[PDB]
Short mmCIF file of C-alpha atoms and ligand atoms in Angstrom, two decimals:
data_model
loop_
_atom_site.label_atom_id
_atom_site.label_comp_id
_atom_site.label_asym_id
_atom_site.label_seq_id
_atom_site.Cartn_x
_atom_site.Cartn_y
_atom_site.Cartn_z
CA UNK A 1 0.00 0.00 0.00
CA UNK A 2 1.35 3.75 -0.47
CA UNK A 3 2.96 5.10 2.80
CA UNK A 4 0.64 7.58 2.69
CA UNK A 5 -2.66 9.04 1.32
CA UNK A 6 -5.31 11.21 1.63
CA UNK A 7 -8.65 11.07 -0.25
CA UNK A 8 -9.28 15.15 -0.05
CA UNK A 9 -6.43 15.20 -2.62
CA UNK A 10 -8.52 13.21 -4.61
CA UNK A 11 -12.30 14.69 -4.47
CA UNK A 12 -13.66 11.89 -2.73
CA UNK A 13 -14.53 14.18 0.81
CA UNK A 14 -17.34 16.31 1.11
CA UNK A 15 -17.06 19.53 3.22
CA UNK A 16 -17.22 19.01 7.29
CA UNK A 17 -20.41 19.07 8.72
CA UNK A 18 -22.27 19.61 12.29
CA UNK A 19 -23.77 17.16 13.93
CA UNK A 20 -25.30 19.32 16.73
CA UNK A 21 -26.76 17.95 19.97
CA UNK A 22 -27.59 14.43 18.31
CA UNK A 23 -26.14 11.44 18.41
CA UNK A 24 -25.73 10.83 14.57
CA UNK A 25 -21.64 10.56 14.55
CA UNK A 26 -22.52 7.13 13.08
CA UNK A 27 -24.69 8.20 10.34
CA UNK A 28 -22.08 11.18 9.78
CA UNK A 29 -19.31 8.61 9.64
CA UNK A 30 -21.66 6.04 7.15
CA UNK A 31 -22.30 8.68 4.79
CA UNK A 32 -18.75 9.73 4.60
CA UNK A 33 -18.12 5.77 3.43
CA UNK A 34 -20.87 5.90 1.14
CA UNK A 35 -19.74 9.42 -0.14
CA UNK A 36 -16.79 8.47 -1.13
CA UNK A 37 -17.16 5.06 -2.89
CA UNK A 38 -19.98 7.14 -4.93
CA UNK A 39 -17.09 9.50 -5.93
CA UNK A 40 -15.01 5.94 -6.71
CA UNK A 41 -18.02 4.51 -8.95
CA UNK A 42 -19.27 7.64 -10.72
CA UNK A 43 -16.71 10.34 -10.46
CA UNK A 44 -18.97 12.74 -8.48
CA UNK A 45 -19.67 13.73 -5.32
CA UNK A 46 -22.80 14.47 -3.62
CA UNK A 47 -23.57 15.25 -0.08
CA UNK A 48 -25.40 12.34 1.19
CA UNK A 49 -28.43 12.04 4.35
CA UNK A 50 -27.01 11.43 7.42
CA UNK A 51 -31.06 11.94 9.06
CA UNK A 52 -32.27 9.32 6.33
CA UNK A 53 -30.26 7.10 8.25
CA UNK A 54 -31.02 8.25 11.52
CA UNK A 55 -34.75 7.95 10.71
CA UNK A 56 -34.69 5.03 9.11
CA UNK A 57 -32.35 2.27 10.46
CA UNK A 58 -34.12 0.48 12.45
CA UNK A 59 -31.66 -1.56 14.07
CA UNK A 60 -29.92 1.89 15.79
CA UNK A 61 -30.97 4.07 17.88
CA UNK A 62 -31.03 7.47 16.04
CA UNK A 63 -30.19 10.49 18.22
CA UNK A 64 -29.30 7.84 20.92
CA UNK A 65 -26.63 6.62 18.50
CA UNK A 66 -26.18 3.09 16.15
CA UNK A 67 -23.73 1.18 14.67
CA UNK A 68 -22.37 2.00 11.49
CA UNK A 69 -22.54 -1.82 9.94
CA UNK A 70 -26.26 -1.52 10.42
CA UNK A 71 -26.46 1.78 8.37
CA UNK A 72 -24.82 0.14 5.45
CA UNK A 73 -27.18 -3.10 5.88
CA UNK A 74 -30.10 -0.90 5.50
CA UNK A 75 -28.96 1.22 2.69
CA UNK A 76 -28.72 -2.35 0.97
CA UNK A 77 -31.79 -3.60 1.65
CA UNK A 78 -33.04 0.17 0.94
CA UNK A 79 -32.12 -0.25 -2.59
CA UNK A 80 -30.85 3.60 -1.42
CA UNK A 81 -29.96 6.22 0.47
CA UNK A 82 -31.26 9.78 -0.13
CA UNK A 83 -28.77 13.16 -0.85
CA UNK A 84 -28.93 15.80 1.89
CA UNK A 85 -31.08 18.10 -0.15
CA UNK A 86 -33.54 15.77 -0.51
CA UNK A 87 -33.73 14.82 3.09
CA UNK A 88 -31.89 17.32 5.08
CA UNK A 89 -30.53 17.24 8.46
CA UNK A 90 -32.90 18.43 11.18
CA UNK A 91 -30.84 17.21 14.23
CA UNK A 92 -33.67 15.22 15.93
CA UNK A 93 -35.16 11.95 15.53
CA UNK A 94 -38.43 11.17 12.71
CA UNK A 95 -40.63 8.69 11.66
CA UNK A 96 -38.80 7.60 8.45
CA UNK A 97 -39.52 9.62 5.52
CA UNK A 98 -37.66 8.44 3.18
CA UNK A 99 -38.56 8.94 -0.41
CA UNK A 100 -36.68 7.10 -3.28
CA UNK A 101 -37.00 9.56 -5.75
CA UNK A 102 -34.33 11.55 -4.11
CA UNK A 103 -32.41 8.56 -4.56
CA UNK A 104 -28.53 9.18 -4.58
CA UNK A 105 -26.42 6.30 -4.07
CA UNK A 106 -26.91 2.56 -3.04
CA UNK A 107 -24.62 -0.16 -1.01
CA UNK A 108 -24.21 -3.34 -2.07
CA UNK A 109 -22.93 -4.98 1.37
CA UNK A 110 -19.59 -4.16 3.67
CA UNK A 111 -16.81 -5.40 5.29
CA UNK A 112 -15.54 -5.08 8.39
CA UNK A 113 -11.87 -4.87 9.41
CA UNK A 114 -10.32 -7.59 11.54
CA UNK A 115 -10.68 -5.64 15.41
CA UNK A 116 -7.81 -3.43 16.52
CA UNK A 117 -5.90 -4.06 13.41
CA UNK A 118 -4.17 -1.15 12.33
CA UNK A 119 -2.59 -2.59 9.10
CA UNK A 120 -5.55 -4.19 7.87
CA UNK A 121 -6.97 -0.28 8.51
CA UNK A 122 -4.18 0.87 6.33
CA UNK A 123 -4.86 -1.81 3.91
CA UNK A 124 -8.42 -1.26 3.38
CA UNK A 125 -8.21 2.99 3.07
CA UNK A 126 -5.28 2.58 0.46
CA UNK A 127 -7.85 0.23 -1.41
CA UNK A 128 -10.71 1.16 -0.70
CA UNK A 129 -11.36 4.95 -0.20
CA UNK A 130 -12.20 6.44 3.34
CA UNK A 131 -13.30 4.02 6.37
CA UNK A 132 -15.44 4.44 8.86
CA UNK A 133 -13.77 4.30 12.28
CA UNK A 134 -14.83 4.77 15.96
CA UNK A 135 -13.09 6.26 18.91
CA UNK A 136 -12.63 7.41 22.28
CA UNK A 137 -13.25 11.17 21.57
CA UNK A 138 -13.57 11.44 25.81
CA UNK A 139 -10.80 13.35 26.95
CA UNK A 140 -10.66 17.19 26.93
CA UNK A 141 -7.10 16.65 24.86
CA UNK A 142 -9.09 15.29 21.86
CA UNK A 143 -11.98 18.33 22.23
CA UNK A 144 -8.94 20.77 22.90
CA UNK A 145 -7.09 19.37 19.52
CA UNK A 146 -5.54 22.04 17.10
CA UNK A 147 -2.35 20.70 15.46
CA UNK A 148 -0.04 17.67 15.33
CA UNK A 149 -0.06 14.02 15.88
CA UNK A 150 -2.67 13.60 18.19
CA UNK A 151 -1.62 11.41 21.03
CA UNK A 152 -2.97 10.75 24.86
CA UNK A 153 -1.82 8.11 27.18
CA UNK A 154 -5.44 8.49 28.81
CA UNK A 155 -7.23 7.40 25.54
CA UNK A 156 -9.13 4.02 26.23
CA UNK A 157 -9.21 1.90 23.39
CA UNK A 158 -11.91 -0.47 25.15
CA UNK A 159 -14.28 2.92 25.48
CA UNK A 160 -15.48 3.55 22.11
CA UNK A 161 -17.91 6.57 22.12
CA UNK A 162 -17.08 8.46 18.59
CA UNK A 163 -18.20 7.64 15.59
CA UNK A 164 -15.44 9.45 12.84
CA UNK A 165 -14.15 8.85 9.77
CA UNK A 166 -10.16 7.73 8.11
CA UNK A 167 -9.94 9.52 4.57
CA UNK A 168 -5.97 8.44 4.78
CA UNK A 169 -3.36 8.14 6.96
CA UNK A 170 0.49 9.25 6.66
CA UNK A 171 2.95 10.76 8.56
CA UNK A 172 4.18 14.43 10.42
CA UNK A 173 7.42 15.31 12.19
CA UNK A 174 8.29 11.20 11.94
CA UNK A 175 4.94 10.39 13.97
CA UNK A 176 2.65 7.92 12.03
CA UNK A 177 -0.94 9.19 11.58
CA UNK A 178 -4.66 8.49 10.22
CA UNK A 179 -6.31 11.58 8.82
CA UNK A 180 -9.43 12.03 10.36
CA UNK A 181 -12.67 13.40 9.31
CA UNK A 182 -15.33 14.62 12.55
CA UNK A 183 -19.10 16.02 11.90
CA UNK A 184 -18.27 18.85 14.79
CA UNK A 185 -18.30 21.58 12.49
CA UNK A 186 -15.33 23.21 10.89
CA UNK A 187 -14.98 25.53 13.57
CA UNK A 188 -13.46 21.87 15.84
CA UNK A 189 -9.88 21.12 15.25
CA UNK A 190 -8.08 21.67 12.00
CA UNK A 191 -10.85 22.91 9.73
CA UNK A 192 -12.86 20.10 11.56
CA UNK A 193 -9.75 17.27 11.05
CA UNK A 194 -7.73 15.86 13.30
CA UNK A 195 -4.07 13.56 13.12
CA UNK A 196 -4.45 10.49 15.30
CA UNK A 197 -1.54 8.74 15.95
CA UNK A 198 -1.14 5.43 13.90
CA UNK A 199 0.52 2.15 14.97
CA UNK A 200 0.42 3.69 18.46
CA UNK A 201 -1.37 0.56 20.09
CA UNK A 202 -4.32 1.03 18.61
CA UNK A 203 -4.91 4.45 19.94
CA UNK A 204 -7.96 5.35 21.71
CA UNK A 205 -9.45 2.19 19.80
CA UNK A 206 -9.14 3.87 16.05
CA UNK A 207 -8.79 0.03 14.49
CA UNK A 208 -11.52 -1.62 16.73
CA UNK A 209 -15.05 -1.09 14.96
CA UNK A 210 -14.19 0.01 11.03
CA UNK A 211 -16.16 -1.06 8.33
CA UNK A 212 -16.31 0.53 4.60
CA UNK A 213 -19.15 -0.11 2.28
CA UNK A 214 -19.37 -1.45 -1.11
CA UNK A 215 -21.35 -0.26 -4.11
N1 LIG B 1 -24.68 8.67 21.12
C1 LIG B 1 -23.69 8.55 20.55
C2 LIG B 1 -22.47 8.38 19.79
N2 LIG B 1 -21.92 7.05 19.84
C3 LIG B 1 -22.39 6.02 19.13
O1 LIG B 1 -23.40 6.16 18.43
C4 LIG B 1 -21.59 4.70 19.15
N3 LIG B 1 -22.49 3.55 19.29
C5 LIG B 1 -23.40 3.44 20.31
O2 LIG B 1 -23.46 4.26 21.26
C6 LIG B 1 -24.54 2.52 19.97
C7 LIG B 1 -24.35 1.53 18.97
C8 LIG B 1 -25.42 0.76 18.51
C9 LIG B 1 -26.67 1.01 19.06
BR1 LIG B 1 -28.22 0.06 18.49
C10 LIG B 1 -26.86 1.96 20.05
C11 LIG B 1 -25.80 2.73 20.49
N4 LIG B 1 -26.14 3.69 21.53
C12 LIG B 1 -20.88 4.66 17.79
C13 LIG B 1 -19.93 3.45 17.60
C14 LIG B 1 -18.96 3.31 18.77
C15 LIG B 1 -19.69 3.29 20.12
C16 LIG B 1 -20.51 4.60 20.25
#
């Protein structure tokens, strides 16, 4: 795989967005997946519905948050998701409205990456596109984050409570990293980004629940 890469270079990242006081970081982090394999497939990129998925997946628990492997199923059974403009964010949980003319991608299954295994990780963004990922985002160090290779000792790996998003992964100053989408706001980190230390032990958990979607 390259040493490094990043999918912004390549078109296949929409802009940051806000989640707001909802628990949708899942449905942030699934439409991130499915934006950028729809890039992948068709050359062009569309904001997808993160509250078509909060609304509609069943199987989570929308503003109480979800699992981002159950997203993916139901865009598959679906036969869709939604763009945003068809079914736009409203930061609150719905009876599902989803209407399939505003159809703008589809998933046709997932994988999931063998738990806490940062290679495999690497593996799957260099061949993939970006992969959804979930953290520890607990500790005022992560909130706090502005430049560099982010890094706590405190970070639990076992206390996954984040839902993000790995559009590459590299290195700065010698310190591996994964490049890493959040959905709080571009006003939060680096323009809404942070640098997570890679091959750090698994740091606070990054390899332990990814998946990536298929269309
Ligand atoms: N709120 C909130 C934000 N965090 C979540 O959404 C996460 N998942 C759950 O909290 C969860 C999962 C599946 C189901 Br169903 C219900 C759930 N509350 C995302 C994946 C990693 C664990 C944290």
């Amino acid at each position: 795989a390259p040493d490094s890469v990043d999918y912004r270079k390549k078109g296949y990242v929409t802009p940051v967005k806000n989640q707001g006081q909802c628990g949708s970081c899942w449905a942030f982090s699934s439409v991130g997946a499915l934006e950028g394999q729809l890039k992948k497939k068709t050359g062009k990129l569309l904001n997808l519905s993160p509250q078509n998925l909060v609304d509609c997946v069943s199987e989570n628990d929308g503003c109480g948050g979800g699992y981002m492997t159950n997203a993916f199923q139901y865009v598959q059974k679906n036969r869709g998701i939604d763009s945003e403009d068809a079914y736009p964010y409203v930061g609150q949980e719905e009876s599902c409205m989803y209407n399939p003319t505003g159809k703008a991608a589809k998933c046709r299954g997932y994988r999931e990456i063998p738990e806490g295994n940062e290679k495999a990780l690497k593996r799957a963004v260099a061949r993939v596109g970006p992969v959804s990922v979930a953290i520890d985002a607990s500790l005022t160090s992560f909130q706090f984050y502005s430049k560099g290779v982010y890094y706590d000792e405190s970070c639990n790996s076992d206390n996954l409570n984040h839902a993000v998003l790995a559009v590459g992964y590299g290195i700065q100053k010698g310190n591996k990293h994964w490049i890493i989408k959040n959905s709080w706001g571009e006003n939060w980190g680096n323009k809404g980004y942070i640098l997570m230390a890679r091959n750090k032990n698994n740091a606070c958990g990054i390899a332990n629940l990814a998946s990536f979607p298929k269309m």
